[PDB]
């Protein structure tokens, strides 16, 4: 995967996962219960700057919803 | 589904249902009051029964 392509594709994936979490939140507002029976806790995504070795910048990773 | 009784859980299934169709139009057959008409040929009924 070419470097700048990697950066922008990581951005696409991260934005998509953020939107999917937001859609789940917006749909599950007013949801009495989960499967086992527990509140539906609203979900958020965590963005971190990717490429831990080198340049301290480049791409976004969305690990740990 | 199956209620395990391990957790307090909702008995969730799903049935929707429809409609309120009228099923009957009952005739409440009680003795009405009497009104005097002074007419000789007129007559009312105490208790049940119908003129044929």
Tell if the CB–CB gap between B10 and A32 is shorter than 8 Å. Answer: yes
A37 touches chain B (CB under 8 A): yes
Residue B4 contacts residue A37 (beta carbons within 8 Å):
no
Contact call for B12 and A33, based on CB within 8 A: yes
Tell me how the structure was determined.
cryo-EM
The token pair at A16 is 């998509």
DSSP characters for B9-50?
Answer: -------------------------------TT----SSS--
CB-based contact (8 Å) between B5 and chain A?
Answer: no
User: Are A25 and A43 within 8 A, CB to CB?
Assistant: yes
Measure the CA–CA gap between B49 and B52, rounded to whole angstroms. 9
Instruction: Give the integer Cα–Cα distance in Å for B43 and B39.
Output: 9
Q: Which residues of A26-58 are buried (b: 16+ CB within 10 A; e: fewer)?
A: eeeeeeeeeeeeeeeeeeebeeeebbeeeeeee
Contact, A36 vs B9, CB < 8 A? yes
Look at residues A63, A59, A65, A61 and name the one whose alpha carbon lies nearest to residue A6: A59
Task: Name the residue of chain A whose CA is nearest to B10's CA.
Answer: A37
Write the DSSP string, A4-57. Answer: HHHHHHHHHHHHHHHHHHHHHHHHHSS----SSS----------EE--SSSSS-
* Cα(A19)–Cα(A25) distance, integer angstroms: 10
Question: Resolution in angstroms for this experimental structure?
Answer: 3.7
Least Cα distance to A19 among A48, A47, A45 occurs for A45
- Tokens representing residue B16 in the block: 């929707």
Separation between Cα atoms, residue B7 and residue A62, nearest integer Å: 33
């Amino acid at each position: 995967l070419l470097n700048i392509f990697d950066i922008a594709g990581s951005a696409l994936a991260a934005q998509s996962k953020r939107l999917n979490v937001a859609a789940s939140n917006l749909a599950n507002a007013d949801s009495v219960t989960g499967p086992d029976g527990q509140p539906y806790r609203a979900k958020q995504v965590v963005f971190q700057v990717d490429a831990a070795p080198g340049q301290a910048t480049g791409g976004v990773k969305v690990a740990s919803v | 589904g199956a209620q395990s009784s391990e957790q307090t859980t909702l008995p969730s299934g799903l049935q929707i249902g429809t409609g309120v169709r009228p099923v009957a139009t009952e005739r409440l057959h009680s003795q009405g009051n009497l009104s005097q008409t002074n007419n000789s040929k007129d007559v009312a009924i105490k208790g049940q029964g119908f003129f044929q």
